[PDB]
């Protein structure tokens, strides 16, 4: 079968907290955990990144801030494999992020099974929780 994303309790709440600042603005994050195709898909821990001046692009992620933070994942038991990069965008009809193009194509080089998550409603919240 395919990979069916299973959102944990903390995985859903942090995505709304990271994109809490502004309707038009945007943030990003890193999904963690380890899983195998044919069932298991899980996201253990999620954490955000500071908003840069380039919005969301290949230069948006900071490898310096990522490496300094990654060393803190091991001592707290938070260290896992990176399964993807989740973002937050106001959303469009098609291509919900106009500034996000070259990211995922650079992400599939490391892992082809990695995905990217964006919170759709961003003030459109309904209660079916469409993501």
């Amino acid at each position: 079968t395919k990979e069916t994303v299973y959102i944990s309790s903390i995985a859903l709440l942090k995505m709304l907290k990271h994109g809490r600042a502004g309707v038009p603005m945007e943030v990003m994050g890193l999904m963690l955990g380890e899983f195998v195709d044919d069932y298991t898909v899980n996201v253990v821990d999620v954490f955000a990144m500071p908003q840069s001046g380039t919005g969301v692009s290949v230069e948006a992620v900071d490898d310096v801030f990522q490496a300094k933070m990654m060393d803190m994942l091991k001592q707290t038991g938070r260290d896992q494999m990176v399964v993807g990069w989740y973002h937050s965008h106001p959303g469009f009809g098609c291509w919900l992020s106009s500034v996000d193009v070259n990211t995922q194509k650079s992400f599939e080089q490391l892992n082809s099974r990695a995905v990217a998550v964006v919170v759709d409603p961003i003030q459109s919240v309904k209660g079916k929780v469409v993501i």
Binding site: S9, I10, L13, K14, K17, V44, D45, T76, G77, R78
Partner: peptide, 17 residues
């Protein structure tokens, strides 16, 4: 907030405390 209550419960199981 429920975000804080559920976050503290995660660090207990992952660290095998």
């Amino acid at each position: 907030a429920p975000l804080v209550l559920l976050s503290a419960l995660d660090h207990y199981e992952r660290t095998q405390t």
